[PDB]
Design a protein around this ligand. Structure first.
Ligand SMILES: COc1cc(C(=O)N2CCOC(C)(C)C2)cc2nc(NCc3cccc(Cl)c3)oc12
Ligand SMILES: *[C@@H]1O[C@H](CO)[C@@H](O)[C@H](O)[C@H]1NC(C)=O
Lengths: 27, 11, 250
């Protein structure tokens, strides 16, 4: 149920350095 | 070995 | 990974290292999909042209890792294999069609800050995200160059490429069970998987539910990071019926 949500990122509402690059490509 | 030894329990 | 960067700590907590015994070496990447199941490429385990035919006792699963070579005491967890399951229609003879395998662990792994499963896509995820130009993320401890090795896990973000462009880049028959990714020569940017990265995940972060999904498995390339070449990835969604069948039975 908790798959794909990273303890050190999504779980804490912190973003990694390049995930915005992925989001910007989803046009 | 380039890899550090693993505790013997895993072997 | 060629022309990538060092992973952040906990950036890819589903990353699995397949580690050979005697002799102690990197075998392949892989990914954690539940507390008992690990996903990889079939060719990591069975590939007769290279005399590769690993049985359960040949290999360990190392989860929660960042450093390639160190034993990451109190962070990584090391798991034994119960059983390997390779797709029965895996085409090792020809083009690595259906390059996919599952491994069941002997004991469930405890999740932590560093150890956490990735999601597998459903039809809707695949349909929304597997589009030319949309970028995914590839991770692994494989070679830094085609012809050296990283201190820590490497990461690269790469765009999915149009099917005709993928086909036109190679003489190999490309099936519907594969997609390709990477930059074109005129795009300027670079990056690819390389030797040691096969079996690892190509992941995308759904903008709908903000979860990471494993869309691909690192399969093969003609060299690494060559101009006009691309990486070829196993299409996880197309093989999910098989995944589901194996997990449901075993
Ligand atoms: C058996 O496994 C492989 C075979 C070959 C190969 O020599 N050929 C020529 C004959 O046809 C094929 C289809 C069998 C491919 C290349 C391989 N590369 C990797 N992994 C590294 C890698 C490098 C770059 C991007 C990705 Cl996605 C992954 O595994 C490979
Ligand atoms: C690989 O090893 C298994 C187990 O020993 C054997 O039964 C199988 O036939 C071998 N397959 C090859 C060499 O293709």
């Amino acid at each position: 149920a908790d798959c794909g949500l990273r303890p050190l990122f999504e779980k804490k509402s912190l973003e990694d350095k390049t995930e915005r690059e992925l989001l910007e490509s989803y046009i | 070995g380039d890899f550090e030894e693993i505790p013997e329990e895993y072997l | 990974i060629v022309e990538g960067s060092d992973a952040e700590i906990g950036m890819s907590p589903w990353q699995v290292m397949l580690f050979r015994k005697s002799p102690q070496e990197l075998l392949c990447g892989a990914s954690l999909i539940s507390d008992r199941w690990v996903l990889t490429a079939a060719h990591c385990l069975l590939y007769p042209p290279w005399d590769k035919n690993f049985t359960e006792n040949d290999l360990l699963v190392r989860i929660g890792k960042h450093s390639r070579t160190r034993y990451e005491r109190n962070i990584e967890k090391i798991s034994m294999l119960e059983k390997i399951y390779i797709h029965p229609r895996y085409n090792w003879r020809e083009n690595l069609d259906r390059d996919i395998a599952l491994m069941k662990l002997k004991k469930p792994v405890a999740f932590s800050d560093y150890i956490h499963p990735v999601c597998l896509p459903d039809r809707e995820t695949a349909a929304s995200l597997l589009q030319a130009g949309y970028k995914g993320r590839v991770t692994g401890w494989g070679n830094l160059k085609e012809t050296g090795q990283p201190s820590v896990l490497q990461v690269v973000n790469l765009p999915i490429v149009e099917r005709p462009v993928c086909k036109d880049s190679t003489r190999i028959r490309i099936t519907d069970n594969m997609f390709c990714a990477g930059y074109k020569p005129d795009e300027g940017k670079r990056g690819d998987a390389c030797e040691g990265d096969s079996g690892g995940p190509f992941v995308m972060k759904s903008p709908f539910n903000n979860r990471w999904y494993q869309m691909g498995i690192v399969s093969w390339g003609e060299g690494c990071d060559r101009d006009g070449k691309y990486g070829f990835y196993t299409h996880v969604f197309r093989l999910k019926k098989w995944i589901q069948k194996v997990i449901d039975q075993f």
